[PDB]
């Protein structure tokens, strides 16, 4: 086609989706990770994670308002990845890298798993 | 903070949101523009348009599944802007610029209004 493109559009959309999340506006699911709960938008979760894409395209699970993650999942690891989904920013630290990598593998977030593997290999 | 950032993340999220729209997955509103209907995600509309942000933060309108636009709104102009919302790509042409600019003013999409004004000024 002969389209023009607005460079910052995708980033601006994501910033507004994060603003809606922070204000709990039109959030439609709560992700339960042991004792912790995280409100989010199903569409954002599906757009970022192979696991959520699978869950919310399922004819029964698409209608659930609560999703319980595997008890082995670390809430802080999930929180870091949820923030990454809504911002493109990953708070990767020596103290959380193992939990972040395990959570990203479970959520099927290949690019995160990749940088975790690379950061771990550099420290060995 | 000490975060790392994945450059293509925002663009990849938007590509997946457009894929969900094309497959009518978790779309939660129909925008009626005279004889035409457009299925979309409320969160994407709010993230792109001052008008939709206002509409879906309203305590009554947030729950509506159908939104009827002003009869003066051109369906093709709306279609072009809806595509832009989900892709960052604007199909701006001599034959549609007036309709696109009028629709962008109504939807409160300032950056689109700006490029339309600039393209019009260059042709006079």
């Amino acid at each position: 086609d002969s389209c023009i493109q607005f460079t910052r559009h995708a980033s601006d959309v994501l910033l507004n989706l994060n603003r809606l999340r922070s204000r709990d506006i039109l959030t439609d699911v709560v992700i339960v990770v042991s004792r912790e709960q995280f409100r989010a938008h199903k569409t954002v979760l599906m757009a970022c994670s192979g696991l959520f894409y699978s869950i919310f395209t399922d004819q029964l699970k698409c209608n659930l308002s609560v999703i319980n993650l595997d008890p082995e999942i670390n809430p802080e690891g999930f929180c870091i990845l949820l923030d990454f989904m809504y911002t493109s920013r990953l708070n990767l630290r020596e103290g959380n890298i193992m939990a972040v990598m395990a959570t990203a593998m479970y959520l099927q977030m290949e690019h995160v798993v990749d940088t975790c593997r690379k950061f771990i290999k550099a420290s060995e | 903070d000490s975060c790392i950032q994945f450059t293509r993340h925002a663009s990849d999220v938007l590509l997946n949101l457009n894929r969900l729209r094309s497959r009518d997955i978790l779309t939660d509103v129909v925008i009626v523009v005279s004889r035409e209907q457009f299925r979309a995600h409320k969160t994407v509309l709010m993230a792109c348009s001052g008008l939709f942000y206002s509409i879906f933060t309203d305590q009554l309108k947030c729950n509506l599944s159908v939104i009827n636009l002003d009869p003066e709104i051109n369906p093709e102009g709306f279609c072009i802007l809806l595509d832009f919302m989900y892709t960052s790509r604007l199909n701006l042409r001599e034959g549609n610029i007036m309709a696109v600019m009028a629709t962008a003013m109504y939807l409160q999409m300032e950056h689109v209004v700006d490029t339309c004004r600039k393209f019009i000024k260059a042709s006079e």
């Binding site: 389209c3 023009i4 460079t7 | -």
Partner: peptide, 4 residues
């Protein structure tokens, strides 16, 4: 705005 750019030519993509």
């Amino acid at each position: 705005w750019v030519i993509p």
